[PDB]
Amino acid sequence: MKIAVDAMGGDNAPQAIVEGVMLAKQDFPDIEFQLYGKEAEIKKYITDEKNITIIHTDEKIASDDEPVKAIRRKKTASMVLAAQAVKNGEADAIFSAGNTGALLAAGLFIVGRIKNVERPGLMSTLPVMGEPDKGFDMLDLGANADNKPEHLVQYAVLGSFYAEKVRNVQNPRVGLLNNGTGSELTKKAFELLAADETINFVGNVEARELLNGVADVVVTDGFTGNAVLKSIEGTAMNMMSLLKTAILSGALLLKNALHGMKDEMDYSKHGGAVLFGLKAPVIKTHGATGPDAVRYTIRQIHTMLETQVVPQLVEYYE
Amino acid sequence: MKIAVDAMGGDNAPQAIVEGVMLAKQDFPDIEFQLYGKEAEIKKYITDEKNITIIHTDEKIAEPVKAIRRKKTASMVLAAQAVKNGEADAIFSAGNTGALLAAGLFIVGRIKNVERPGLMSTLPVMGEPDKGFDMLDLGANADNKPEHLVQYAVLGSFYAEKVRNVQNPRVGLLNNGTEETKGSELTKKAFELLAADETINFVGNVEARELLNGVADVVVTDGFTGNAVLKSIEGTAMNMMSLLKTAILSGALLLKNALHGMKDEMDYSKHGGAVLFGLKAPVIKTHGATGPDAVRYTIRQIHTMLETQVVPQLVEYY
């Protein structure tokens, strides 16, 4: 087991990335990590050198170079090197808390997509209210800005594989995000999904209930998925802000309420966003990650590697 | 000024609808109301008979379009028909959204040269109870063209400027990022069209995470995305509220004040119902769970639309 790590991506990188690896080393004593970045800045945070190699580079993907030209031209950016390592068979998986668009490009043009999957999907395990050991997979969360009916069908297939093999959800319920109990897209996707007996399709799901466990896998196009996810996050943060302001004004019940709301909404506990439908595990850790979300990303990677979920996808399609 | 009222639509109808009209008659003693529905039910809640006509029918809408061209006697259709016939200036209903959408489109009719009417609501801005932002389409349509979003920007600007007194209203395009480039096929072309239109204060791309924070006065989107965004916001807000409600019911006062303040920030029906906008007369959808308050705010909104002549100014424009 070997993981290539973009050490330079993230608001708190390289510190948060390295420290998150330090913690994950304790979870997983035999994983070897390759840390791609400027070694001087990385070394400052290394606490134990075992199963660590540093690959030095002074290049990193900028805020903001355009993603496909940066991937094709900045050949030594830390993220590019990490992805190339995976492509080469030098590593088994890559994660970055860096720019999402760049990682998508690296995923498409360096890691490669599984043949017969035209459009990989950005997928996260999201919150089920009251259920800390449950979640639901939703995709596409933003790999694509346009989708066709056939993409959403393969999202159901991809999402089900992950929910079942990685999260142990047997015969997972697949719902289609729609505008009632739809568009030309969702109309056609519904018909294809209802016709496939190998998918446990549960019909249309409503955005109002997404956080209440209506399906194990929710399928949508990348534009709607992006807008829904960020709508959920923006509303949650705005509700939490209201509490913070009252707290910053008996106060203990209110601090506990805020803490509990943060916990319910803390879905990076389940890992990062999988760029799923690619030839190896590639994860987008959220950009404001500290060490914990890095550590949860590595746990998710460990599970994907140990369950061989990507190689099974490959033999399924390829 | 005559308003046609669907007395039968809504959870709490007709109690809540007539109680709403009773209050509105005190705000506006010279508006005449026609209350469509069965009179034995309607009369029970009349508390002053001045300026109230009842049009009896025992039929009410339980398929939208089919049930509209068929049930010529249903309370909603009669009310919608009356404004068509020129017997009433405006119509509202707390009944089914689809049927009111059908009734608005097919009976009231669209302003000529507006392609698709857009469902529009003034939505919250955090910390600012005298401010809002108009968003459309929130679900009249499940598919849209780039040119429809240009119209939505104009319609929204007229409403924000003439009805809500917002000068030179900022128009934002809901998009998947801030860059011009950046977007689905629909939003790439809409961005270009909106930036060329000299009628509008186009402010560029707005992101869904920040919608509640006053980033624009008018936010423009397709009906599928707008429905998903709106319902995502509501579903998230209600879930946060449930977390507080469970804490309360288990310093308890600081919690119920927090819950109450949260409900107040999200209580956007105080600005009126959802406008079926781009139609030939004011037609508004009052929320299904309405009491007398949201009916009364609906009446105030139509009073303002009529007084400001917003529909006439949109005909002129087109």
PDB file of C-alpha atoms in Angstrom, chain A residues 129 145-146 177-179 182-184 186 206-209 211-212 221 223-224 226-228 230-239 242-243 250-251 253-254 257 261 264-265, chain B residues 126 142-143 174-177 183-185 187 206-209 212-213 224-225 227-229 231-240 243-244 251-252 254-255 258 262 265-266:
ATOM      1  CA  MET A 129     -29.591  13.499  10.439  1.00  0.00           C
ATOM      2  CA  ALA A 145     -21.298  21.036 -15.713  1.00  0.00           C
ATOM      3  CA  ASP A 146     -23.387  19.122 -18.281  1.00  0.00           C
ATOM      4  CA  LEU A 177     -32.784  13.892  -7.538  1.00  0.00           C
ATOM      5  CA  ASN A 178     -35.796  15.456  -9.227  1.00  0.00           C
ATOM      6  CA  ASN A 179     -38.235  18.326  -8.944  1.00  0.00           C
ATOM      7  CA  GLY A 182     -38.730  16.520 -14.304  1.00  0.00           C
ATOM      8  CA  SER A 183     -36.365  17.986 -16.884  1.00  0.00           C
ATOM      9  CA  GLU A 184     -35.724  16.302 -20.243  1.00  0.00           C
ATOM     10  CA  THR A 186     -34.274  13.460 -15.365  1.00  0.00           C
ATOM     11  CA  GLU A 206     -36.845  15.520  -3.096  1.00  0.00           C
ATOM     12  CA  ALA A 207     -34.038  18.007  -2.186  1.00  0.00           C
ATOM     13  CA  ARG A 208     -35.931  19.029   0.981  1.00  0.00           C
ATOM     14  CA  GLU A 209     -35.377  15.604   2.525  1.00  0.00           C
ATOM     15  CA  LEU A 211     -30.404  15.002   4.864  1.00  0.00           C
ATOM     16  CA  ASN A 212     -33.059  12.566   6.216  1.00  0.00           C
ATOM     17  CA  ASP A 221     -25.916  16.010 -12.895  1.00  0.00           C
ATOM     18  CA  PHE A 223     -24.324  21.404 -12.054  1.00  0.00           C
ATOM     19  CA  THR A 224     -27.391  20.625  -9.883  1.00  0.00           C
ATOM     20  CA  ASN A 226     -22.781  21.415  -7.057  1.00  0.00           C
ATOM     21  CA  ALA A 227     -25.623  23.889  -6.459  1.00  0.00           C
ATOM     22  CA  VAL A 228     -27.440  21.604  -3.992  1.00  0.00           C
ATOM     23  CA  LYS A 230     -23.224  24.373  -1.661  1.00  0.00           C
ATOM     24  CA  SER A 231     -26.819  25.422  -0.854  1.00  0.00           C
ATOM     25  CA  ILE A 232     -26.839  22.882   1.967  1.00  0.00           C
ATOM     26  CA  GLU A 233     -23.403  24.023   3.212  1.00  0.00           C
ATOM     27  CA  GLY A 234     -24.261  27.750   2.954  1.00  0.00           C
ATOM     28  CA  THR A 235     -27.545  27.351   4.825  1.00  0.00           C
ATOM     29  CA  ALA A 236     -25.920  25.187   7.539  1.00  0.00           C
ATOM     30  CA  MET A 237     -23.132  27.758   8.040  1.00  0.00           C
ATOM     31  CA  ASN A 238     -25.669  30.624   8.146  1.00  0.00           C
ATOM     32  CA  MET A 239     -27.783  28.836  10.777  1.00  0.00           C
ATOM     33  CA  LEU A 242     -26.820  32.821  14.169  1.00  0.00           C
ATOM     34  CA  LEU A 243     -25.940  30.611  17.141  1.00  0.00           C
ATOM     35  CA  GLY A 250     -27.407  29.176  30.128  1.00  0.00           C
ATOM     36  CA  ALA A 251     -24.865  29.921  27.385  1.00  0.00           C
ATOM     37  CA  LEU A 253     -26.911  24.798  26.140  1.00  0.00           C
ATOM     38  CA  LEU A 254     -26.322  27.122  23.179  1.00  0.00           C
ATOM     39  CA  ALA A 257     -26.359  23.142  20.299  1.00  0.00           C
ATOM     40  CA  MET A 261     -25.034  20.970  14.701  1.00  0.00           C
ATOM     41  CA  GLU A 264     -24.162  16.464  12.256  1.00  0.00           C
ATOM     42  CA  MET A 265     -22.863  18.512   9.328  1.00  0.00           C
TER      43      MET A 265
ATOM     44  CA  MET B 126     -29.285  37.252   7.013  1.00  0.00           C
ATOM     45  CA  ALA B 142     -37.825  22.177 -15.690  1.00  0.00           C
ATOM     46  CA  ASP B 143     -35.805  23.285 -18.721  1.00  0.00           C
ATOM     47  CA  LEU B 174     -26.405  31.504 -10.288  1.00  0.00           C
ATOM     48  CA  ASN B 175     -23.397  29.551 -11.514  1.00  0.00           C
ATOM     49  CA  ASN B 176     -20.980  26.753 -10.501  1.00  0.00           C
ATOM     50  CA  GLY B 177     -18.116  29.217  -9.924  1.00  0.00           C
ATOM     51  CA  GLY B 183     -20.659  27.027 -16.233  1.00  0.00           C
ATOM     52  CA  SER B 184     -22.914  24.686 -18.113  1.00  0.00           C
ATOM     53  CA  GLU B 185     -23.787  25.326 -21.777  1.00  0.00           C
ATOM     54  CA  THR B 187     -24.979  29.467 -18.029  1.00  0.00           C
ATOM     55  CA  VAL B 206     -23.085  34.337  -7.874  1.00  0.00           C
ATOM     56  CA  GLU B 207     -22.367  31.158  -5.954  1.00  0.00           C
ATOM     57  CA  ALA B 208     -25.005  29.165  -4.119  1.00  0.00           C
ATOM     58  CA  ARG B 209     -23.130  29.142  -0.782  1.00  0.00           C
ATOM     59  CA  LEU B 212     -28.549  34.184   1.907  1.00  0.00           C
ATOM     60  CA  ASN B 213     -25.856  36.872   2.395  1.00  0.00           C
ATOM     61  CA  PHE B 224     -34.795  22.951 -12.326  1.00  0.00           C
ATOM     62  CA  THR B 225     -31.768  24.379 -10.528  1.00  0.00           C
ATOM     63  CA  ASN B 227     -36.281  24.405  -7.390  1.00  0.00           C
ATOM     64  CA  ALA B 228     -33.375  22.262  -6.193  1.00  0.00           C
ATOM     65  CA  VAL B 229     -31.641  25.296  -4.599  1.00  0.00           C
ATOM     66  CA  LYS B 231     -35.814  23.229  -1.480  1.00  0.00           C
ATOM     67  CA  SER B 232     -32.207  22.511  -0.409  1.00  0.00           C
ATOM     68  CA  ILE B 233     -32.178  25.757   1.593  1.00  0.00           C
ATOM     69  CA  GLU B 234     -35.566  25.011   3.191  1.00  0.00           C
ATOM     70  CA  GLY B 235     -34.708  21.385   3.940  1.00  0.00           C
ATOM     71  CA  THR B 236     -31.399  22.372   5.530  1.00  0.00           C
ATOM     72  CA  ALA B 237     -32.972  25.241   7.532  1.00  0.00           C
ATOM     73  CA  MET B 238     -35.743  22.935   8.829  1.00  0.00           C
ATOM     74  CA  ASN B 239     -33.224  20.288   9.822  1.00  0.00           C
ATOM     75  CA  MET B 240     -31.134  22.771  11.784  1.00  0.00           C
ATOM     76  CA  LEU B 243     -31.932  20.005  16.181  1.00  0.00           C
ATOM     77  CA  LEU B 244     -32.796  22.962  18.416  1.00  0.00           C
ATOM     78  CA  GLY B 251     -30.994  28.062  29.898  1.00  0.00           C
ATOM     79  CA  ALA B 252     -33.818  26.438  27.936  1.00  0.00           C
ATOM     80  CA  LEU B 254     -31.788  30.922  25.341  1.00  0.00           C
ATOM     81  CA  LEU B 255     -32.473  27.937  23.047  1.00  0.00           C
ATOM     82  CA  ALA B 258     -32.389  30.941  19.173  1.00  0.00           C
ATOM     83  CA  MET B 262     -33.857  31.340  13.214  1.00  0.00           C
ATOM     84  CA  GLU B 265     -34.766  34.988   9.544  1.00  0.00           C
ATOM     85  CA  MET B 266     -36.098  32.217   7.247  1.00  0.00           C
TER      86      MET B 266
END
